[PDB]
């Protein structure tokens, strides 16, 4: 949480390069979602904003495919519908 929090602060500063620099320290430290789903959701909801800046239209597809985590995501049709719609829209 500590190392993830300052990413939003850097976004507030509007310094994308530093955000992309600091984000690389969490890629290998996955499987933190075994008991903390909301932390994983918060993490994924930031690279979407980050990559939307310049032109990256395919990595965000990978993120939305990664929103296929614990059925605490897909058992909520009211938002699961658009969660699975946006991936096929962005492909």
Curated annotation (Swiss-Prot):
The modification N6-acetyllysine is found at residue 38. Belongs to the proteasome subunit p55 family. Component of the 26S proteasome, a multiprotein complex involved in the ATP-dependent degradation of ubiquitinated proteins. This complex plays a key role in the maintenance of protein homeostasis by removing misfolded or damaged proteins, which could impair cellular functions, and by removing proteins whose functions are no longer required. Therefore, the proteasome participates in numerous cellular processes, including cell cycle progression, apoptosis, or DNA damage repair. It is linked to Stankiewicz-Isidor syndrome: A neurodevelopmental disorder characterized by delayed psychomotor development, intellectual disability, behavioral disorders, mild dysmorphism, ophthalmologic anomalies, feeding difficulties, deafness, and variable congenital malformations of the cardiac and/or urogenital systems. Component of the 19S proteasome regulatory particle complex. The 26S proteasome consists of a 20S core particle (CP) and two 19S regulatory subunits (RP). The regulatory particle is made of a lid composed of 9 subunits including PSMD12, a base containing 6 ATPases and few additional components. Interacts with ERCC6. This is 26S proteasome non-ATPase regulatory subunit 12. It comes from Homo sapiens (Human). The gene is PSMD12. The chain holds residues 184 to 274 of 456 of the full protein.
